[PDB]
Amino acid sequence: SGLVKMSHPSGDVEACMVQVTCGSMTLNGLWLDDTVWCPRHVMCPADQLSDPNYDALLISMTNHSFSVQKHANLRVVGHAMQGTLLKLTVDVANPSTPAYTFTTVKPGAAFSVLACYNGRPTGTFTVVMRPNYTIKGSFLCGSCGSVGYTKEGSVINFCYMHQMELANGTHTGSAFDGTMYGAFMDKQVHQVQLTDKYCSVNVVAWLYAAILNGCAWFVKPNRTSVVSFNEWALANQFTEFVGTQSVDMLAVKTGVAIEQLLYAIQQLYTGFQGKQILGSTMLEDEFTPEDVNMQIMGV
């Protein structure tokens, strides 16, 4: 296929990982310049996990309550709470802080994750933000504070800090503005998730990937317009399709129009009828148009 699950090289982010302890809890933190970010649930004790009252928690804390370690040693000289995260300030500026921003990722967008335990980076994988604002990851006890990010030129865009497992193999976390993806609360009550959905734009990308590899049996002259497909999407668990220049690029290189692949989606969704594509028996929606442009073309 020439399509692999590709994440960014992780060196830049490895040098920012630290361990943070408060009370009984230990987990990972992200050390950027003079601040260390970590999940605020590091504060509460075992038998309040179901309903913490984080504000009262914050008050009971001092700078001495938190211990930060690079596994130098770091002295915390300030603590603040920003939504579901702690913003700790420490007396040493991370000598290898990369150029960075904080940006919240949208459903369908991919990013790289550095899984960490006890401040030790143990591995990377890429994931797509689900239409239901969860992520299908690989996170175990000890995982929280692990970090997700994209990269643009030299700038690392931090978009995710791991927080919790909502149900078997299904995860969520906060953006660095402290908000949780989407609206989930950091307490151990049962919480209902919205129904996940196929990411239309990504499935389209994947089909263009197939065409570029000479697998084009599913292409017909028939078309479905963007507007009719979106009305169909609503009733069939697909996200609304929104075109981008990177998709447009794929359409131009292959000569196959977006709306021919919209039609093909409608048909393939009902069944592959014995055949394979690249070579699966179901639609793939975890590759973005930019993945396809990058891994297969230029670009």
């Binding site: 995982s143 927080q163 909502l166 609360m185 307490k187 151990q188 009550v189 049962h190």
Partner: peptide
């Protein structure tokens, strides 16, 4: 069910 990690 929601499990803090």
């Amino acid at each position: 069910x929601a499990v803090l990690x």
